Amino acid sequence: DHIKVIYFNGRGRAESIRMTLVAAGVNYEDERISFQDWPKIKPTIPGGRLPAVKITDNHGHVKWMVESLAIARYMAKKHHMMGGTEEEYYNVEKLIGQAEDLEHEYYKTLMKPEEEKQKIIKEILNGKVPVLLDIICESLKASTGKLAVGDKVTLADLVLIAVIDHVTDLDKEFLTGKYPEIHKHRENLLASSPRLAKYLSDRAATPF
Amino acid sequence: DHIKVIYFNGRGRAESIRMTLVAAGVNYEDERISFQDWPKIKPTIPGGRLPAVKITDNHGHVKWMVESLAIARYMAKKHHMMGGTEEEYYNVEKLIGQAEDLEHEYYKTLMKPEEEKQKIIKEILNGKVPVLLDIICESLKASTGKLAVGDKVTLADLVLIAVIDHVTDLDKEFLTGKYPEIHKHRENLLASSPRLAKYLSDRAATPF
Ligand SMILES: N[C@H](CCC(=O)N[C@@H](CS)C(=O)NCC(=O)O)C(=O)O
Ligand SMILES: N[C@H](CCC(=O)N[C@@H](CS)C(=O)NCC(=O)O)C(=O)O
């Protein structure tokens, strides 16, 4: 099967899909669309939004997938990364929901003409961001393993590390000297996943 | 088992949990905390945030759950409401992610001193809301059954109808004469679920 991930030049919503595939060891073609070329590409995409995933068979079948975390979860479910039990399933999802809350705090800073961007960053770094980082810390503390849930990689590991990269985009020292469970989590994750470690070292710094 | 759902006086984040339980036919105690009483209740809640679910055994065990859609999904997974296949699982999640996008549009209108509330409602009803309602329409159209995914209730049915109630909170006629797949979906859902129909008729109108 040929797997094509279609997104813009960045981490953004596609990141959970790429990391899932990378961690799973699944090869894919990583297609980035420029903002200039997007007007002509948009009509060729079912739903006209990105990220979109196009999966092609060696027998001519073509499957289109949209909705990033639905794709990530389906892929994660395929490669045993959503929990081995109901309880682990719950905990994966708990950490994902918490990580997404924080992502939505990060979203508030986008499409902002600066100045009010800065005024928002302050609002959130002084408000909900620390609250959420702490809740995430507690979610990690309650694990029986080195990682988010047990000792094996799950989608929760991947979604977490992408969201932290967004926090550090707003304030690079925000986690320095604090939240030891999150630093340690990243450390354990990269140790557990040489593929994800190499992938992370080959990005390709992007503004989002 | 005794199941206690703890939230504020409203639909909000707890709604997906209540509906899941109701649809599943699972009895629970529905605890609403007043804003006046919240300061004293907050420290007794693991993580200090709501919704929280407290499950008690007939053998003294006490299980605390937080993170609404993680709880809803776990419960939905228990009662066969997350898909019977990987493909159905994907489609449940696709519709949930789309419904949550729209919920986040709705969130933008909250905590707003009016006036700017109205200015936002206009922004979103003229921008992303119609885009999302249409995408949801396409997700429903691609189902092989009367409901979101097949003919049986899944968490996607429940999350959708709660999000539409929030859209109609902003503008009650926004879907009048439009989006036939969404009206029909609600119609099929209530037909398929007498329990959810009765539950919906016994709310208890709330501001959120
Ligand atoms: N629920 C999101 C929605 C994706 C989304 O907001 N797409 C944006 C880019 S990040 C987009 O396609 N906007 C450009 C357009 O609508 O034409 C997902 O994770 O898939
Ligand atoms: N990810 C959300 C977070 C819940 C949340 O934002 N809780 C709010 C009420 S809707 C809250 O507990 N705020 C009051 C407080 O933090 O003390 C969930 O679905 O559980």
From Swiss-Prot, chains A, B:
Domain GST C-terminal, first and last residues per copy: 85-208
Classification via Gene3D superfamilies: 1.20.1050.10, Glutaredoxin
UniProt GO molecular function: glutathione transferase activity
Effect of residue 18 to Q: Reduces catalytic activity 120-fold
Gene Ontology terms describing biological process: glutathione metabolic process
Reactions catalysed according to its record: RX + glutathione = an S-substituted glutathione + a halide anion + H(+)
Keywords from the named record: Transferase
Domain GST N-terminal positions: 1-83
A Pfam family assignment: GST_C
InterPro entries in the cross-refs: Glutathione-S-Trfase_C-like (IPR010987), Glutathione-S-Trfase_C_sf (IPR036282), Glutathione_S-Trfase (IPR040079), Glutathione_S-Trfase_N (IPR004045), GST_C (IPR004046), GST_superfamily (IPR050213), Thioredoxin-like_sf (IPR036249)
Annotated residues for binding of glutathione: 7, 13, 38, 42, 50, 67-68, 101
Entry EC number(s): 2.5.1.18
Role description: Conjugation of reduced glutathione to a wide number of exogenous and endogenous hydrophobic electrophiles. GST isoenzymes appear to play a central role in the parasite detoxification system. Other functions are also suspected including a role in increasing the solubility of haematin in the parasite gut.
Quaternary structure and partners: Homodimer.
Similarity remark: Belongs to the GST superfamily. Mu family.
Protein name, per record: Glutathione S-transferase class-mu 28 kDa isozyme
Organism taxonomic ancestry: Eukaryota, Metazoa, Spiralia, Lophotrochozoa, Platyhelminthes
